[model samples]
Target: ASPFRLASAGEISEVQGILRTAGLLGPEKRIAYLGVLDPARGAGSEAEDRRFRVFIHDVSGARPQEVTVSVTNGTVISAVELDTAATGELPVLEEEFEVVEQLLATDERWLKALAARNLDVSKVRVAPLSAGVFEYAEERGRRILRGLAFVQDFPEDSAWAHPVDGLVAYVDVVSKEVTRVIDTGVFPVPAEHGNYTDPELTGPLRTTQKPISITQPEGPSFTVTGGNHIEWEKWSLDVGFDVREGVVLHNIAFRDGDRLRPIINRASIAEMVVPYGDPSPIRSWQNYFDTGEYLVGQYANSLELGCDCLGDITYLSPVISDAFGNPREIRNGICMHEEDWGILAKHSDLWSGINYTRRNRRMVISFFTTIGNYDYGFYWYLYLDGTIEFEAKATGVVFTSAFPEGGSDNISQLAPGLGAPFHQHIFSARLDMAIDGFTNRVEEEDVVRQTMGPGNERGNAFSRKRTVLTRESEAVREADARTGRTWIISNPESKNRLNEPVGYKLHAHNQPTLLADPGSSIARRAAFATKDLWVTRYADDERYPTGDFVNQHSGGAGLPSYIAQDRDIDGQDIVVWHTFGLTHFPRVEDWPIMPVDTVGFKLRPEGFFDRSPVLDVPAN
Candidate 1:
């Protein structure tokens, strides 16, 4: 009965039908996204009010429009167009990708550039890139995607390895033609095809390692009450999906004794950016807002049983809207399973020869998405110790450029003729924390080393310092590894047995933030990744860190704009946005396919519980 659930397929169709009848959707118009209209910041009761939020892209000319429709009453609530000031371009659709490919085939300039490079137009693959902001007169307020070419020998060839360096085409999808083409100096295609899937090229598979299988003979330790509602151990949450932000978990709570204590009202990976470090004009504008521009959920991979998951798996098929406003299903979009962690707690009594040990278990909910050459897997884990973890795995092929020996510092020679650019994957996770209730506060806790004082003359004293982040501006801070910094989101009214606020501590992964300079266009567009954490006054409309629309955005939106009010967050309903991920300086071993690189953070119970929650585990 809660509005926190995802919009059903029927609801999506209903909304589309309403729009289509109202002359809001047609061949010139499309649905960019459709999801449940998130209830007001603090409204989640069973008052029976439900609605859907839809984004419409008018392909011909007008700005993108947002419509709110009431599902319960079957009527349109409101519709408004977002001006260029408040919006960037909408996400690039799959159909647009196809349109660009066909448009490139007819452009004589694009064909001539390829012919000059001794490349065949038929064997080339055009990658539609989110045209970045550059203040070009023709690119301003236009639906454009920059086209980059890669040559492939055959259908199964990985074209990424044979990049046609130095040539760029600006294609305006609405105009149905190439606006401009820039051909810098060209380089020879790499000698290696970089196809790891071909068994003959890879020689032979390793046979030394034995098979390790995982099975829960007694079945899984989790239960699905409905389609999306999940319960395992003391954890419970509803899994939802957004076209932009995938794998959203709603109403996350823990069953503590006689009460269902709420921790997070909602959680999701709000936004992510991958920025390259090359300074070449062709490669300089290489930053991509994956979640915002590409729509990771729409291109999510359908997980397999033994390959992607194991040990009694459960899947949730999320329903989403395609570019044409039709409902599409991402089967196995969300994967749920239980993993056996090595040890929970252990103790041994030497004199009495007594030993105590407990094995740890965690319920994992995860999904994988492929964005062009990169494959990312997002995981959410809930442990019996009242700890929550979020990890993002980056695999797939590493993006490559033509090898230029003794070139810039950005190039990593992966092979004799193949070079990969240095890049960083920055991800932001929005945790709508409720702690024990809706009223919560955040405090920065850092372990400080103290000098000699009246109580400690040896100067070896150290203490923990806790500072409350009272305002939005004060909360925009970075992690300090030297001080062992952590943030605590606690309920001001709820107290633990130790007379402390019931709270959870955020342990950040503490990876490098954006390396781009302040004046860089990417820095402005991905401003959220410039800081480690941002606390904002709760608002139903503020969901994405990069804002609702990020394609070709100029900047000064999303988190930066939300915090511009400088509102008080002390003891108020607040949301925490943490930015974390990894930077890749590729090695030779990462050529054809890169191994999975994992990055994440942890939310551990600080004073939320009175005692160990897993003490009831029976001895084996």
Candidate 2:
């Protein structure tokens, strides 16, 4: 078994100590946990003995460099610095908003203003805002961290339950001053009568449904490697996370007989764009690149045992940089367990009355991240039959814009008539496949109907038009139920007993395309989603579909620029980029909390293996 574990809090602290000793730590230097690089595949050493990697961002110089540190038995072997630092990946932490709220509550003017409306100054709600306002203080060289304010009907709901409406404040987090406050108009907290972001079911009331239960006769069938890797059945999985991309599973491999075979080299949520439809000033530029603007993992909520997960789960702690720009462990950031997947395969004979049923089991890894008002839950499932599935769920209350006239175009009605404008949540996962070997090919297979009078006069036959995508551009696929268009990643050298090349097919669902005009800023900036699928020659630095820095960015950059070269992709290492999203039109039910709207894609083994790997699986 591979010994791959996530770095612990103590290990990280020790690493910090090593940096300090190496003169890399000072008041002007900040540290951000990038991730650990796994040991080489064929190296004959303890895989658990891996290197810890971090980004050293210099506050004084505004330059960032990468560091690779080796630790053994709580001692640092060596710390290597790459010297070169790229300026873009570092982002402002959202924690500074708390400091802003604290300073405002101390002001007499702010206190009197709050007390007038029966509001508690202590419970003020503050949300993130890009640098601006806290106005005049800047003239004299004041650095203020600013945030928009919202009122709470405490015992009401979550922080996003109510909006103060037209209220924004500025405060110098460094200079300890509530610089300024502006009320463009009087916007009160929306009525709390319909607020359901917080569950009020303190006791079990109206329990009238049959109960369901999942019991493992023994216990979970999976063993976690180090901490981030899972060893279950015939599969081995490695998981990681970043502030922007959430959970990233890499080096996903399946055991074939006595040997481990590679599946995907890298698999992750590359980018996300949430664009609003309204053209109003407050919303027109609301094309949010969630990954680029904020760190999603920082808002990850802790998963409860019986409520959020069932079965015996192995919890993995997340290492994310705190507000101070130091690595801190976020407890219960990811969860893993085994799930029942119905039947693997079933067969019955009428002649013999003999029946065989093999129950299906899959290993599931879950991680969550919240961007502003919405909480996104992501799940990755590895089936015993060599099938992999990715699922996402969006919940939490709506982030509504203020309505002075009190009217709503949104499905969910908030207080004083605020409309939650229609919007779209687009997400793309970059799957870099290495099916058996590094060099692979992607083939597009379209199911088409046969012409009448040629093979069949009644036109009752259908056939497959298989075409090998020899170039990168040929991999741009569209969803067609009639054609059943699908792409398969295969190795020409590997073949199964059926004389067909072994491969895995990319079966996509809920594959919604980008709706904005081709020339629009939102469309141009997030050009990766304009297509259902894109195949590109592997480039180490081209990770994000949208560029690394997405805050208030206009058109240009991202996948559109990366693929401008349109390099040939055939018989080379290929990266599969897929976009799956929903054209979300909000409603009343979606007001307080939206149910799980899951979008999924499956990488099912086409002919990679000769037979069903789980045919001899155990049954419950």
Candidate 3:
């Protein structure tokens, strides 16, 4: 008999019927060949004769739910629900319904709006592209692509419980009608309602013991202060920040030429490096016995896997500094000042003694990172004491968060008896500094000579320094005065749970302290630069009840809290880049063929950067 026996036409029809009844396949669905199955191909079998594994997608949901199906003997051998939710084999029907409803509503409005804009509408078509998948076809109605839709899933819950489910609809430019529906029966995981229990969870219930305000206090307007000017000689330093997750992301670069370009390029390269942590070990054992005459039989199997990589490429760049004080040659060292410095300070809102002053046609920037919190953060700037000022802003903070249970407790703490899990805090940033006076020297060698001279030599001579900058350092002292408030807010009561509408907002303000000489005029200037603020809001417990998943949740499709908002900053949209991933530090034994690393972004930059800023610069 042939290894491959063809299935009769009747058998194929019967298989198809089973799939239809199970809501696994539909007419509008398309099967794209992903790869051939190795097991199905006989020894020495040609690639063309191999059985192909295909991805069957439901195009109706906001995002398609793809299922992997194997076809051999013209019969379905395996059908796996890759995107469907499974709460002990029971789909969360209510959540699925909500997703579908929202998708339909949003999709309809989108189509209508498009038609009003005079775009081509005839080439658009919307349809349930798969079992629970919906697709919006555009561009002459030939290609099926993703459309706007809402996806809701509890992140803290386990991924196995809440699956992704939503509407996928496209707008018809002419008719302005969204007409496709894919209904994957998947649903997001439900929020955990039971009491939390995790060894990692530790901390107090309240974010702060005393109240704080958010209102701007009555104080002198912040003025520009003096800033430091760094010059390099044989060595160059490039610094940049990765402001993706509302954090002070920094990277540094030091090379022989082109400070800014090299910094930017080096940052990009560093971003690609994968940092994997240590892994746990696995062990196995077996025992067997035999009786009477001949022999006995036995079998054993064991394997172990450890935690995934937690650290990511927070910041990367070349170290820029030298022993001498010669300026580095580079195009476009720090150009504008206010936008970079002011915006960063305002958003971070955790600084002391910030002052901006202008004198002799020169601008100076100065600030201190509270005395006791040395590792709290760092600031870098560039400017001259003479005319024509230049400035850049970069700061670093010990990025830490408290879990609901037994985690590390530092600046922020949880309420007592409200033990939650916690993890070690990870922190990193990038600082980009620019230098002038490079043109003053005739050759690049001379520039290097003046910047990295004897006096400039400090600390280690390495390109970068990784120190345990802690909060207890004398450089990071506590603030003298701090001010904050709480306002009542409300949310609709749940039908299942009886209670009055629940909501509230807590707010607060922090007073800026003087970082430099407290008695100096610059210190007074720093005082003038900051204002006492006030905030009004309820406590975090009243709102989140459970901990909030700003970045990744325990379960569901982890939706990030920070969304990219468009704002014009110096003729450019300051699109924030946020990313999450699993990083595993490699072991020596696995040095040969490293396993492929997997990472993904919830959102990517589209029309974010007009052009690669460092494209014209020569590669190092």
Candidate 4:
């Protein structure tokens, strides 16, 4: 029997139909067919036959929708269309035609030109000009001046004037002038599978499946118990980190009962002072501060009664020189608000309210951890924001030679005198965010007001939901018994091979998170505990969904061997482990103020050993 099964011809035709109707494939375009099956071991067998099947989808809006073409015979097998009447949604051709109409409406000549053409002006929404001071740059000894530009949204295929239906115009930066409009021309839309132009899949298709059974090395061992019942108190404290001296100290403690009360009272006080800072100083404090009061009241009223409201606040003083001492509080009232409360007595939640001065480099993050009680347990997160490097210092717990052969290990195998077992294995961690949804704001009336003037308009309101992923893995390196060689495995490949790196990276919308961890002790531990879900896209293959792998492949050995099975970690039901410490690099600039670091990871579905396992089972 062939090692891999080929998808049915009907399945391929269905996918092709979907792609063509979705505008991914155009008429008369030739497509190369590659079967998603594993290469057979021997020739002269059914598995060795490379030819599978090919089909040409004639989307001429005629009777026969698709003509099946055979690879082996070079003849048409059949012409069929399960649904000939189905017509898919076309790509937006005049995305911004209405915006142009409104802009031209002020000029009678331009309006007449549009009106004479019978253009639909109702769909256009005026997009504002993105205003900012641009700095010039020097390239190859030439002085390049920069300026501002206005952006407009338009259809990709619309022409410009009567000749074009889809055209876009923008201000030119070189001359601080508007350039002639240009049409984007017929660009190929992305296929349903993904962007075909992504070059990451051009590598060789090599698969290797081997049993991963490594014997535990004789080293300092530690016990990792499951379901540990430890008594802990969750409290919110005002913590401050002095950037200049690199010291973290306690600031204030908010009792469980005083949580919402203080925020409500503070809002009242801030209201009175807001008028003095406002443009109209004579306005009543009631009106000026009502907004602040409403915010506090809304938060206070939303709080569950008879529950502890743990919270924290931090103030970042100015960065002072030793000779000058602390500069008179540049700006005060900086705070970090935290709350640990349950929603509808079911879901426990933690939220932080951040506030800081314009020049303040430090930020206060509050943590809220609740169990059973609606608003009971909470913690404070106070750290420097701008650029503060964090050396490992000491990761909470470290277990050496801790191997879990389906269970925990409890043996002391370290140096005789070295007290308890310390974790000697490497670990990895990552933090990633989709920049398009997380950082990019959507433009709306309120958003425009916030950007244009004094208002609480949330920018980018129409943006998609933000997606963030954090991964941690443990025990990435172990001694191989067969070869007597140590293998260093990682959840996701680190960028810098020499200097172990772990951290976060910003990705575009729907783009996969690139690995962003620098070699750090804490990062390693985080990555190791979260490696179960790191997914890497591979070439198309059968036996796997979408040809993605979840485990590390051998360095010299071509494809991955066992995919990581899903398991729980850190009390999370569905958690993946990733080891991060194996990657670390220290730079001179990272000494004092460290740059904001992050990393990204993924999770994928694990396959079953049996063929069509779900097919044999009875459906409800």
- Displacement of residue 289 (Cα, Å) in model 4 is 37
Q: What TM-score against the true fold does each predicted structure earn?
A: 0.97, 0.83, 0.19, 0.17
Overall lDDT per candidate, in order of appearance: 0.87, 0.70, 0.22, 0.22
User: Which ranges in model 3 have alpha carbons more than 4 Å from their true place?
Assistant: 1-103, 106-175, 186-620
Q: After superposition, how far is residue 398 of candidate 4 from its true place, in Å?
A: 44
CA error at residue 296 for candidate 2, angstroms:
2.6
The better-scoring model by TM-score among 2 and 3 is: 2
In terms of lDDT, which candidate is stronger, 1 or 2? 1
Which structure is stronger by lDDT: 2 or 3?
A: 2
Best by lDDT: 1
Give a tens-digit lDDT track for model 4, residues 199-316. Answer: 4532544467554432323421111122111111212222222211111221111122233101000000111001111111111110111111111111111222123222333222
lDDT tens digits, residues 226-327, model 3? 121122221122232111111121222223234331121111111111111111000000000000000000000011111110111011111111111111
Judging by TM-score against the true structure, name the best candidate: 1
Q: State the TM-score for model 2.
A: 0.83
lDDT against true structure, model 4: 0.22
The C-alpha RMSD of each candidate to the native structure, in angstroms, is: 1.6, 4.9, 30.1, 32.6
